[PDB]
From a paper:
Phytochromes are biliprotein photoreceptors widespread amongst microorganisms and ubiquitous in plants where they control developmental processes as diverse as germination, stem elongation and floral induction through the photoconversion of inactive Pr to the Pfr signalling state. The principal role of phyA is to detect exceedingly low light levels by integrating photons over prolonged periods, whereby molecules in the inactive Pr state are converted to and accumulate as the Pfr signalling state in the nucleus (the very low fluence response or VLFR). Here we report crystal structures of the chromophore-binding module of soybean phytochrome A, including ~2.2 Å XFEL structures of Pr and Pfr at ambient temperature and high resolution cryogenic structures of Pr.
Phytochromobilin (PΦB) rather than PCB is the native chromophore in plant phytochromes. Indeed, the different adducts show subtle differences: not only is λmax red-shifted on account of the PΦB D-ring vinyl side chain, in phyB, the rate of thermal reversion in vitro is faster for PΦB- than for PCB-adducts.
Numbering used by the authors:
A (entry chain A): 67 to 110, 120 to 345, 360 to 407
B (entry chain B): 67 to 109, 120 to 345, 360 to 406
Write the structure that this text describes.
């Protein structure tokens, strides 16, 4: 069963669009790093390895903000942090989460001349999502079809992907594409049913906790995460924004002409279950910044509430 | 409206919490500045008329403001986080346009706020979006319950001592129809006020400037100087920093509302100013632009629900 989960947490591979550090929960020093992190974060005991102090990597407001995060509980972390590398000023969004023993930081590059617009762009992303949420709210109740069609249209406009689908899980765990919008000319997948095994339990289980997942390029060469072999626990990457897709799925995307994807879990009663996914595909590589993904998380949460109301209301009328 | 509009539209006095520049769209050079701008933005001659912003700000900052000249008002995404070239001091630059001028308000940012710039913007908008979902799920039918919820939500989001819903009657006089305060404050719930307490000129400006903040009614106002070559006065009333008229400043001091934040409630935005959400604080208070921006959208949603409650009511 869960030889799948072993590889999906302890696989130690990330997507190369960003890099990863894990810091010790007490010393704040590097205990693990992706192999691309030296070249991404430094110009260059190298400049970056096990035991590196982050005060040597980043400017003082940047390192200061990460040191302070080492003091904050998980739910109290406000992401992302805007960080600059020492000397170069090279900027990244740092997205922080905690595992037992460690603070994990995903670093996603930002275009330097866009740094002045970071707050502006984050507000605009959430504003657009918030407007989408008001349009979901004003929909007349009583039609799951209208709700799902509206949601895929909103996600399509917000995210700019080639294809957006609502993928519903049936009682037997097989899935169905129940709503879809594409750029003109693409073949539809609307209506198609797919076996339970296309989306393994481990992936469904992960979606309960990791609610938005982005794959930038299914063909990109994955990068290993190295950790001190004496670290008294294994570092899991299930929470990382950068976690590489399992090679099977990477192959699956290749076969389907989805080079890129963005997937939002739809969890009702967040008893709790995965109702389905909002699945975005792109024909070419696609990156969208963490603020938009964050705004999409809330949109998906509101959608799930409305989904569950439509279920209740058609459970009642019958 | 005769006299008031002249002075308010020119907006030659600002609050000292921030500073203002106006740039000529054609040249990108300074054509107006608040008298505190030299001290705030500098430590190449003095900042004055004719100054090139490439001498005031770091290169990415100056480029971001120069790029803003090529956006229609409606397409400006605010704020811009700028750093001063000499000091490295950070500010939020809030940009608006008046014809061929670009007007920039600069509000200081604390050094530890800079790395959390996007994080704090998302959190402010997330809190406001959650407030919006609670407004939406309110059962229809009660203007009172709607306004009560709104003042509660604004109170929690903004941290002011007092939040009121202030409704304009057909004769333009006002009534406080909902209120929440910290314990011990004197209530104004239910009180009616004359139309003249909020002049037409003020009500007209709220149609366009939807959120207005006063940090400290006692603070000494700062003059804006403009290019002597201009044969007319610039309009600076779009500024976030515009100083309150001294009559209003006195009224606040009288009332022991030292600070305020006021949101316009415009229905059919039939288009009219239904009222105001009025926040007061006993002591000075500043809230940063991203939160005020998020408040603007909360107020817009509120206005939609107010007009629904009006229509549900005219149906009975
Ligand atoms: C390999 C032997 C098997 C397998 C494994 C597998 N699949 C996933 C994850 C996903 N598979 C998805 C399938 C679909 N996506 C679509 O667009 C459609 C239909 C139009 C289907 C049916 C989706 C979605 C996911 C989620 C991926 C994501 O974005 O996170 C995984 C986990 C991948 C990971 O590492 O997270 C694995 C191991 N898939 C197969 O087809 C075979 C049977
Ligand atoms: C001066 C002779 C007259 C006058 C002028 C005046 N008033 C305003 C603006 C406002 N007055 C407000 C009044 C209230 N605030 C409250 O909390 C209550 C009741 C509880 C009332 C009635 C409010 C609000 C405003 C808006 C101010 C804001 O925050 O923008 C103005 C415009 C000031 C400006 O510079 O924008 C002027 C010129 N007020 C008087 O009382 C007398 C008659």
């Amino acid at each position: 069963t869960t030889a799948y989960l072993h590889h999906m947490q302890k696989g130690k591979m990330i997507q190369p669009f960003g890099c990863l550090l894990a810091l010790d929960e007490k010393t704040c020093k590097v205990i693990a790093y992706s192999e691309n992190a030296p070249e991404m974060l430094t110009m260059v005991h190298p400049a970056l390895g096990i035991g590196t102090d982050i005060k040597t990597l980043f400017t003082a407001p940047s390192a200061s903000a990460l040191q302070k995060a080492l003091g904050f509980a998980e739910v109290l972390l406000l992401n992302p942090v805007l960080i600059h590398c020492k000397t170069s000023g090279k900027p990244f969004y740092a997205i922080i989460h905690r595992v037992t023993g460690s603070m994990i930081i995903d670093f996603e590059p930002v275009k330097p001349y866009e740094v002045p617009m970071t707050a502006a762009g984050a507000l605009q992303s959430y504003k657009l999502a918030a407007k989408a949420i008001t349009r979901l709210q004003s929909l007349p109740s009583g039609s799951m079809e209208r709700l799902c069609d509206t949601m895929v249209q909103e996600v399509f406009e917000l995210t700019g992907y080639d294809r957006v689908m609502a993928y519903k899980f049936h009682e037997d765990d097989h899935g169905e594409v129940i709503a879809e919008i594409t750029k003109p000319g693409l073949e539809p997948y609307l209506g198609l049913h797919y076996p339970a095994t296309d989306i393994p339990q481990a992936s469904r289980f992960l979606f309960m906790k990791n609610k938005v997942r982005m794959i930038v390029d299914c063909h990109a060469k994955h990068v290993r995460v190295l950790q001190d072999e004496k670290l008294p626990f294994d570092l899991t990457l299930c929470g990382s924004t950068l976690r590489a897709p399992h090679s099977c799925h990477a192959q699956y995307m290749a076969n389907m002409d989805s080079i890129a994807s963005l997937v939002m879990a739809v969890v009702v009663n967040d008893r709790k279950r995965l109702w389905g996914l909002v699945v975005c595909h792109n024909t070419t590589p696609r990156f969208v910044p963490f603020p938009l993904r964050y705004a999409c998380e809330f949109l998906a949460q509101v959608f799930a509430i409305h989904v569950n109301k439509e279920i209740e209301l058609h459970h009642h009328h019958h």
